[PDB]
Design a protein around this ligand. Structure first.
Ligand code: NAI
Ligand code: FMN
Ligand code: SF4
Ligand code: SF4
Ligand code: SF4
Ligand code: SF4
Ligand code: SF4
Ligand code: FES
Ligand code: FES
Lengths: 226, 439, 139, 156, 225, 120
């Protein structure tokens, strides 16, 4: 399929949505709730781009690139002013209740939420009211739980239930009091629960085994191994 | 007020002593005859076509065409498992019309659901009813039992050979359950998060099956169409919206209530001739046409016909046509604070802008109510209204949430500016660090 | 309009003089945030371009800079000639109060440029430095 | 220490007969347990999950999603007063102040003897007769602040 | 037959435009202080003569490099594990310039014949108990069980028994019975397994003292002790 | 809080530390060493500290006889006072529960509302 991103013509696969098509081409669109393995649900509303149906169109319409197919003849703008302000506003809304926790967070320097806050260019706080807090659960010896850092992107529950087939992780709560975890305390008995520390874009689910002797990602010496 | 069957196709069979009408009395005064004609003389396709040519729009508030919605179910015969759902939630503030429809006329809803289930070839029907309507639930169950025993529900209905089973699913008290896809999710025993469309419920709805969700008042309009004809239905009022709508004014008026009026009647006729106007010593300041999720309108908008396109052209929505009047004694900042508190606490939490921006508007309005507003708060509210509009959020709870806020800022800005008393201060002084003083 | 914007610098009269002298298919113009017209020229025409800039009515009389650059690791080179290495010559005309930056593209094996010392005598140490740190030979 | 009684079990099974998925009876199963015991305790989530076959995480999510499925212990009678826009116009604040003066609690708590639990609720669909209040199964309309003490004595 | 392991990875002379592949990110810190307690003279970084990687950040880790062995994902603006998006030709698809590792053998042109050695039906012999293996993701590996964090995750050693066999032996759930294999009278507590077939004892392979070679073996003198 | 921002912000790389955790859950440096024979006294670590723990004091008399003794450890760096910033505590802003500070007890933080609460 042929799409037009910011006036530039691109050849994409028409069976993919606009987010993975644009991320494949190297175009940076912010996103939280979409994962390549899980699918598209349109939750976080972070992947907004301005869509036009014609080459001669001025108004457009803010759509979700993860929920919009990459059909032939779509003219989308990523760095349009309205789309950038909406993505910055989504980051700001996620930043209203987020705790001042980055130094004492195991996901600091490896955080998707940090990267997307920096990418949208939001660095000034106008919210002056209180931030909601949450209690934490004991998830066993492997996964450490810190519920205050959640952005309600539903990646954890989607992976753990619709992909791994687990039965003890879920969404609870309400309007802005959404909780993600177990109905009680106990060990996550899924054999693939360790992928939650990389599925979660925030520092809610963290590696407790790494948290015992913790260093940042830049301090790590890596190797490819089996 | 006198209600002939011609101009009052819904409320003419209401009793003066406000008791429910049961099967013998309902069938005495021309009951279940439209269902008889539908099930003995017409194919489902021509019934759908009759509803389409009747111009019956959706009475839930959006005004979508009912026949066009019915025509969108798949035409192949491989899927014989089909569902018809009656959205008896009616959780919107200012809305009390479905309560009147099902508390005193349950057999009308049963007959309309039977007609619409035969038209859609829907093998099962569920009345998704809110938990607060208790006597409505009792009346609906008793009417269902009476119709089941008297050869109208169950197996081989009226000798045709059509099987239809009707159930009442009593809800558990959440406002978002009235959204049709969230209604489907709640019917499947899940959390009532709405779903993205496409796919629409007509192709894959409840349990992956073709499913049609309709309001109570639409299914109460359908038996009058199938009984008294289509041309009679198009000749009720000389307006682009065919049929009669349950309209009415509520809130500090002389006679608040609910009356069946044809489309095109102006809101002033409802306020003075039916509602009686404002009460003693009270003046008129504003009004809301379609419940809590509609734009506020002023006194100059009162001489406006109550159609979808007429109210829509004047920067509002017809909604459920149950208008609510705001007097001069009501502070509009407090009213919008109450509205936003309801809309924020009845969020489902699926998508970011509603979930994490409606409480921001709530806290801004709490600050403005107490006089602790700071500069930039009204601009923040305007930006929230712009960034919570249609298409920005996953469902339509949040655009309807933010419509009263932008309407109040547009029409009554001087009340919002009066709550800004203290200067803007987000930071506190850290001793040893000179702050950056931006200009 | 802010002063940090990426300017293509096609309004400079030196670009028009170079088009009218060497033709419209002799060089590429790179849009940068340098504030200086960046002209990618061929290696064979480098001395001719330098002589033309030295013989202008308000000539570029000063060689401000001369150095190499390893472009083997440069991922974003859209609108640039293909190069493993490059040599840039920054020149100043005080009379026009203008600058120009001539860039010459070199492959990894053919790392030789004609010397610039005859046109500008201060090119000697710059070319020695470019040979020392980048391995580019100056014939 | 929780165990479903017999009548709750046949009620849940009979509601499972109504749907083609046993998951679809979860809301009514929670409502049946709440009707029997006043609220839904911790073991009821796992017992309903066992009797339906769905995981307990989904039952907990359904129970915590809906406001009328009480996951905390309540009093003998649940007072539910409407705080929506039309009753705000009709003056629900006086009714709430009278309830706070009588029961001597905040909205959301239960009295010390466990008689009344006071809760705000959304629109009751009776806005033409506002302000309204839903005690356990009875709706009360045209409320006045002096009718609260004469109206709270019919629920012992 | 092991000829494909040469092409599994390129040799130590492989370079990306002359430089090696970095094992650590470019912002690796503490270089002049991580060894200063031993000596204030910082030694040379260790040299990797075996592979194409280097024990330093002086190397290549670009998302557009022509290699298949990626030590870690990092891109400018992408510090999360979402940085793997830049290292793939399409997101969620193959790795760019192919995935590492090659297959040793291809599918043969012809296949085998039918195995005619059909085994007999399992008859529970009196006295002898067939050992049914019960593998655990935490516990049945040789080296993973030596990790101290797996001690709080590994299940307790429980021998699984049929209700009928435990009723015959007089054992209920919880109590300890002793069995002897190769002169080792070891005692395990009993867990009742309904799904296990009669005549078998369920044993956890890879635990302390119970080798995976015990699967399918016999078990004499199973008495309550 | 052993967040390692000073070590990576150091252009010279003369800061080394390791994070450890107490029983309550608060973070601290298990060790903290600075190679002062290698430090250039540029103040980037103090600039990058989000807790104002590391500071550059007005002191210059650090002459030494052996540069092995110029590797200062945590016992040589940790002082008994706030230094140049007298009334800043990072843990009053953090949302992580430690001793003497439960959930919601930080600045601009609301009380934790349970999902089992009866309020809508
Ligand atoms: N208690 C109540 O009565 C409440 C009513 N509302 C009303 O609900 C409206 C929003 O309803 P939504 O369902 O979110 O919006 P909508 O306009 O997208 O859908 C309304 C109806 O139109 C149908 N529809 C629309 N376009 C269609 C298409 N292309 N193909 C098939 N079917 C199509 C849908 O199936 C649905 O039944 C609000 O504008 C408001 O008037 C809102 C809140 C409460
Ligand atoms: C937040 C929200 C709440 C809604 N609540 C109701 C409701 O309570 N009752 C209703 O009939 N429609 C409600 N709707 C409208 C439905 O989406 C849909 O229009 C209805 O199920 C059928 O409409 P119809 O009358 O056009 O067939 C709601 C929509 C939204 C966005
Ligand atoms: S999850 Fe990310 S943004 Fe939130 S505190 Fe941790 S590092 Fe900071
Ligand atoms: S816990 Fe993590 S993965 Fe789950 S919704 Fe919250 S931010 Fe997303
Ligand atoms: S706008 Fe979003 S969070 Fe709000 S009710 Fe709709 S889907 Fe849920
Ligand atoms: S002052 Fe010293 S320790 Fe601090 S960042 Fe600069 S060189 Fe590093
Ligand atoms: S001294 Fe400051 S910057 Fe360094 S690890 Fe400690 S808290 Fe972080
Ligand atoms: S990535 Fe598209 S809405 Fe989340
Ligand atoms: S607003 Fe209170 S009953 Fe509707």
């Amino acid at each position: 399929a042929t799409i037009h991103v910011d006036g530039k013509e691109y050849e994409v696969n028409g069976a993919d949505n606009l987010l993975e098509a644009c991320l494949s081409l190297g175009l940076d669109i912010p996103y939280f709730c979409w994962h390549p393995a899980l699918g598209s649900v349109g939750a976080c509303r972070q992947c907004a781009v301005k869509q036009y149906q014609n080459a001669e169109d001025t108004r457009g319409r803010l759509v979700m690139s993860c929920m919009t197919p990459a059909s032939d003849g779509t003219f989308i703008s990523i760095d349009d002013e309205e789309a950038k302000q909406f993505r910055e506003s989504v980051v700001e809304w996620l930043m209203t209740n987020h705790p001042h926790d980055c130094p004492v967070c195991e996901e600091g320097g490896n955080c998707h939420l940090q990267d997307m806050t920096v990418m949208t260019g939001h660095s000034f706080r106008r919210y002056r009211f209180t931030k909601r807090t949450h209690r934490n659960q004991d998830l066993g010896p492997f996964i450490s739980h810190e519920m205050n850092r959640c952005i309600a992107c539903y990646r954890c529950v989607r992976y753990y239930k619709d992909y791994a087939g687990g039965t003890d992780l879920g969404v609870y709560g309400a309007h802005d009091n959404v909780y993600f975890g177990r109905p009680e305390d106990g060990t996550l008995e899924s054999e693939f629960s360790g992928n939650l520390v990389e599925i979660c874009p925030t520092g809610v689910f963290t590696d407790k085994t790494h948290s015992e002797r913790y260093n940042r990602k830049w301090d790590m010496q890596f190797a490819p191994s089996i | 007020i006198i209600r002939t069957p011609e101009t009052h196709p819904l409320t003419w069979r209401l009793r003066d002593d406000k008791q429910p009408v049961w099967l013998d009395e309902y069938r005495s005064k021309n009951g279940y005859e439209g269902a008889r004609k539908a099930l003995t003389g017409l194919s489902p396709d021509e019934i759908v076509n009759q509803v389409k040519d009747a111009g019956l729009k959706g009475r839930g508030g959006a005004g979508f065409s009912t026949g066009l919605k019915w025509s969108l179910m798949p035409k192949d015969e491989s899927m014989n498992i089909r569902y018809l759902l009656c959205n008896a939630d009616e959780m919107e503030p200012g809305t009390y019309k479905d309560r009147l429809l099902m508390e005193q006329l349950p057999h009308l809803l049963v007959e309309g659901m039977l007609i619409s289930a035969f038209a859609l070839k829907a093998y099962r029907g569920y009345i998704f009813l809110r938990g607060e309507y208790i006597e409505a639930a009792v009346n609906l169950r008793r009417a269902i039992a009476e119709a089941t025993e008297a050869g109208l529900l169950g197996k081989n209905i009226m000798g045709t050979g059509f099987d239809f089973e009707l159930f009442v699913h009593t809800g558990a008290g959440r406002y978002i359950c009235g959204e049709e896809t969230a209604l489907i999710n709640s019917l499947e025993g899940r959390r009532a998060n709405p779903r993205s469309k496409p796919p629409f419920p007509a192709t894959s709805g409840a349990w992956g099956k073709p499913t049609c969700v309709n309001n109570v008042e639409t299914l109460c309009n359908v038996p009058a169409i199938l009984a008294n004809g289509v041309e009679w239905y198009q000749n009720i009022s000389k307006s682009k919206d065919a049929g009669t709508k349950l309209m009415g004014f509520s809130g500090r008026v002389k006679n608040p209530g609910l009356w069946e009026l044809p489309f095109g009647t102006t809101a002033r006729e409802i306020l003075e001739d039916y509602a009686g106007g404002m009460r003693d010593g009270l003046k008129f300041k504003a009004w809301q046409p379609g419940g809590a999720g509609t734009d506020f309108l002023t006194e100059a908008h009162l001489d406006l016909p109550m159609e979808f396109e007429s109210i829509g052209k004047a920067g509002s929505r017809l909604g459920t046509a149950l208008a609510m009047a705001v007097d001069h004694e009501i502070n509009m900042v407090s009213l919008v604070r109450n509205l936003e508190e309801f809309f924020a606490r009845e969020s489902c939490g699926w998508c970011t802008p509603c979930r994490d921006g409606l409480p921001w508007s709530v806290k801004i309005l709490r600050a403005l109510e107490r006089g602790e507003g700071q500069p930039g708060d009204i601009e923040t509210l305007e930006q929230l209204c712009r960034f919570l509009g249609p298409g920005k959020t996953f469902c339509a709870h949040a655009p309807g949430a933010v419509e009263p806020l932008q309407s109040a800022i547009k029409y009554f800005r001087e009340e919002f500016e009066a709550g800004i008393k203290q200067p803007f201060s987000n930071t506190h002084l850290i001793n040893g660090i000179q702050p950056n003083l931006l200009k | 309009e802010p002063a940090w914007q990426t300017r293509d610098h096609l309004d400079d009269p030196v670009i028009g003089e170079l088009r009218n002298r060497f033709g419209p298919d002799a060089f590429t113009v790179q849009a940068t945030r340098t504030g200086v017209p960046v002209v990618w020229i061929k290696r064979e025409q480098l001395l001719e371009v330098g002589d033309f800039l030295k013989k202008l009515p308000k000539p570029y009389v000063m060689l401000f800079d001369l150095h190499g650059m390893d472009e083997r690791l440069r991922t974003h080179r859209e609108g640039l000639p293909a190069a493993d290495f490059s040599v840039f010559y920054h020149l100043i005309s005080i009379d026009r109060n203008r600058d120009i930056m001539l860039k010459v593209a070199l492959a990894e094996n053919d790392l030789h440029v004609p010397t610039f010392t005859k046109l500008f005598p201060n090119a000697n140490w710059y070319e020695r430095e470019t040979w020392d740190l980048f391995g580019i030979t100056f014939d | 220490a929780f165990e479903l009684s017999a009548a709750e079990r046949e009620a849940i099974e009979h509601e499972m007969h109504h749907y083609e998925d046993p998951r679809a009876a979860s809301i009514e199963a929670l409502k049946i347990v709440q009707k029997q015991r006043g609220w839904v305790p911790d073991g009821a989530i796992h017992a309903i999950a066992d009797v339906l076959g769905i995981p307990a995480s989904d039952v907990e999510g359904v129970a915590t999603f809906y406001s009328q499925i009480f996951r905390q212990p309540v009093g003998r009678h649940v007072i539910r007063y409407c705080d929506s826009v039309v009753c705000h116009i009709n003056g629900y604040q006086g009714i709430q102040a009278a309830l706070e003066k009588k029961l001597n609690i905040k909205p959301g708590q239960t009295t010390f003897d466990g008689r009344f639990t006071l809760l705000p609720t959304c629109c009751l669909g009776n806005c033409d007769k506002g302000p309204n209040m839903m005690i356990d199964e009875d709706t009360h309309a045209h409320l006045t602040p002096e009718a609260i003490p004469e109206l709270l004595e019919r629920y012992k | 037959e092991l000829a494909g392991i040469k092409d599994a990875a390129p040799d130590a002379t492989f370079r990306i435009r002359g430089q090696k592949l970095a094992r650590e990110p470019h912002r690796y810190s503490g270089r002049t202080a991580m060894r200063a307690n031993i000596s204030v003279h910082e030694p040379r970084q260790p040299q990797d003569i075996d592979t194409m990687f280097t024990f330093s950040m002086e190397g290549n880790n670009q998302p557009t490099a022509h290699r298949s062995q990626v030590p870690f994902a990092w891109a400018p603006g992408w510090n999360s594990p979402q940085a793997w998006n830049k290292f793939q030709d399409e997101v969620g698809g193959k790795l760019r310039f192919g995935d590492p590792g090659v297959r040793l053998f291809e599918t043969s042109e012809n296949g085998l014949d039918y195995f005619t050695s059909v085994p007999a039906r399992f008859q529970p012999q009196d006295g002898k108990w067939r050992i049914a293996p019960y593998y655990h993701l935490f516990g049945s590996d040789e080296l993973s069980q030596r990790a101290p964090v797996f001690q709080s995750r590994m299940p307790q050693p429980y021998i699984k028994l049929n209700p009928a066999d435990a009723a015959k032996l007089g054992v209920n759930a919880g109590t300890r019975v002793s069995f002897s294999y190769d002169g080792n009278t070891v005692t395990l507590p009993v867990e009742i397994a309904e799904g296990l077939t009669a005549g078998q004892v369920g044993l956890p392979m890879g635990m302390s003292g119970i080798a995976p070679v015990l699967a399918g073996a016999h078990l004499e003198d199973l008495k309550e002790a | 809080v052993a967040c390692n921002l000073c070590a990576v912000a150091c252009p010279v790389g003369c800061i080394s530390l390791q994070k450890a955790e107490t029983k309550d859950g608060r973070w601290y440096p298990e060790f903290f060493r600075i190679n002062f024979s290698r430090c250039i006294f540029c103040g980037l670590c103090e600039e990058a500290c989000p807790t104002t723990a590391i500071q550059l004091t007005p002191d210059f008399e650090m002459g030494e006889y052996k540069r092995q003794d110029l590797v200062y450890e945590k016992e040589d760096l940790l002082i008994s006072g706030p230094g140049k910033y007298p009334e800043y505590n990072f843990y009053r802003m953090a949302g992580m529960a430690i001793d003497g500070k439960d959930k919601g007890e930080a600045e601009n933080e609301a009380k934790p509302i349970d999902v089992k609460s009866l309020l809508p």
